[PDB]
Design a protein around this ligand. Structure first.
Ligand SMILES: Nc1nc2c(ncn2[C@@H]2O[C@H](COP(=O)(O)OP(=O)(O)NP(=O)(O)O)[C@@H](O)[C@H]2O)c(=O)[nH]1
Ligand SMILES: [Mg+2]
Length: 173
């Protein structure tokens, strides 16, 4: 099995992405405490992928890193429509992962891709003087954190969803 650990701010869509990917179902917001999912996947070919779905809420900061030993690949996730979560990629998640796992490959994943170029979402953000994260900004952030790939997905439409796991696996094999 490959151990893939998924981290990122509360509500960015970690659980939706894992459940959408393993089951084709879309939940179902219940904040995660901790869950383990597993998929037998064909990449490039069969793989047992163990997915560790972590708590994004700050109450679990002291506990979350207990999950980290032995990880094969990390997914650091941020919502493409939440600039705070994007800044936390380098302000919180990158350092927390690296504190514990200096070497383990990171994939940076921008989530809720279906909302990024949604007009109502862009309007609401604009009122707040903010704008969705664009692909080149995500790429710059991937570079700044030495992520091995930057990928965008939607758990809702499944755009980009398979490639996230193909690349997590390619990162390890
Ligand atoms: N529009 C859209 N909404 C999404 C998508 N993925 C998740 N959401 C919404 O964002 C909310 C948070 O989703 P969830 O996966 O539970 O977030 P989480 O990162 O696992 N939060 P926690 O760290 O607290 O477990 C849910 O209401 C969910 O339906 C998406 O791909 N598109
Ligand atoms: Mg969750």
């Amino acid at each position: 099995a490959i151990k893939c650990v998924v981290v990122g701010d509360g509500a960015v869509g970690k659980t939706c992405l894992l459940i959408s990917y393993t089951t084709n179902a879309f939940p179902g917001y219940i904040p995660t405490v901790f869950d383990n999912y597993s998929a037998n996947v064909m990449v490039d070919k069969p793989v047992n992928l163990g997915l560790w779905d972590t708590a994004g809420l700050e109450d679990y900061d002291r506990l979350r890193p207990l999950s980290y030993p032995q990880t094969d690949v990390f997914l650091i996730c941020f919502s493409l429509v939440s600039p705070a979560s994007f800044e936390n990629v380098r302000a919180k998640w990158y350092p927390e992962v690296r504190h514990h796992c200096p070497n383990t490959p990171i994939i940076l994943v921008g989530t809720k891709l279906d909302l990024r170029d949604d007009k109502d979402t862009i309007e609401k953000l604009k009122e707040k003087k903010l704008t969705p994260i664009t692909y080149p900004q995500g790429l710059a952030m991937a570079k700044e954190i030495g992520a091995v790939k930057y990928l965008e997905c939607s758990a809702l439409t499944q755009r980009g969803l398979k490639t996230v796991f193909d690349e997590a696996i390619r990162a390890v094999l």
